[PDB]
Amino acid sequence: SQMTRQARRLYVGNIPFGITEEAMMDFFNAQMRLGGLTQAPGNPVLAVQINQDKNFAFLEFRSVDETTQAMAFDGIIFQGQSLKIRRPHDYQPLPGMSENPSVYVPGVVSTVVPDSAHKLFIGGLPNYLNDDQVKELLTSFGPLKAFNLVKDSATGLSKGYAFCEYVDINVTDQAIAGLNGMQLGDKKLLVQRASVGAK
Ligand code: NA
Ligand code: NA
Ligand code: NA
């Protein structure tokens, strides 16, 4: 249906270099099924359009409700990268239909890290570390509620700093103690609440 198309599409950012539309479709169709999010036989994702130059994709789903459920995959790791899943900017919630996902996907860590009391900044990361490896560094201290590694939009290369929020706010000081000042060749990690050094 044409009226619901805006409510059946999602933006996916930070996609792996060189990924094909078929590989992305298969990934999401499988994850939807394995996660218990798919609501009928057959594929929930109908199509994927990739903008290779600009590093983003749009997924199109067969139903409004499956599209909403797929928002729960925000931050899922695909080929080392934390996929950013968002509504299209022109999306308008429909009457009587839900706007937010209802099913949690175990192990998936959101990419939305709002400014808050215990949001952490991690600066000085080696630029060869992908999203997955930086997530593992941080998860050593405890489970994350949210995380984003900052990249150069034109090249896709890590800018060497990230933000995060732990599930347990009390882990924040443990990560600071374990990581702040750590020396890595020419780099020295700065790990502190992001409010301390925000511009
Ligand atoms: Na990227
Ligand atoms: Na880009
Ligand atoms: Na945007």
UniProtKB/Swiss-Prot annotation:
**Taxonomically, which superkingdom?**
Eukaryota
TM spans (from-to): none
- What family, per the record? Belongs to the splicing factor SR family.
Compartment(s): Nucleus
Q: Mark the residues carrying the PTM 5-hydroxylysine.
A: 135
Entry protein name: Splicing factor U2AF 65 kDa subunit
Q: Which disorder is recorded?
A: Developmental delay, dysmorphic facies, and brain anomalies: An autosomal dominant disorder characterized by global developmental delay with intellectual disability and speech delay, epilepsy, hypotonia, short stature, microcephaly, intermittent exotropia, and non-specific facial dysmorphism. Brain imaging shows a thin corpus callosum and/or delayed myelination.
Q: Kindly list the positions at which Phosphoserine occurs in this protein.
A: 153
What does the subunit section of this Swiss-Prot or TrEMBL entry state? Answer: Interacts with U2AF1L4. Heterodimer with U2AF1. Binds unphosphorylated SF1. Interacts with SCAF11 and SNW1. Interacts with ZRSR2/U2AF1-RS2. Interacts with RBM17. Interacts with PRPF19; the interaction is direct. Interacts with POLR2A (via the C-terminal domain); recruits PRPF19 and the Prp19 complex to the pre-mRNA. Interacts with KHDC4 (Isoform 2). Interacts with ZRSR2. Interacts with the SF3B complex composed of SF3B1, SF3B2, SF3B3, SF3B4, SF3B5, SF3B6 and PHF5A.
What function is annotated for this protein? Plays a role in pre-mRNA splicing and 3'-end processing. By recruiting PRPF19 and the PRP19C/Prp19 complex/NTC/Nineteen complex to the RNA polymerase II C-terminal domain (CTD), and thereby pre-mRNA, may couple transcription to splicing. Induces cardiac troponin-T (TNNT2) pre-mRNA exon inclusion in muscle. Regulates the TNNT2 exon 5 inclusion through competition with MBNL1. Binds preferentially to a single-stranded structure within the polypyrimidine tract of TNNT2 intron 4 during spliceosome assembly.
Q: Which gene encodes it?
A: U2AF2
What sequence ranges are listed for the domain RRM? 8-90, 118-196
Organism whose genome encodes this protein: Homo sapiens
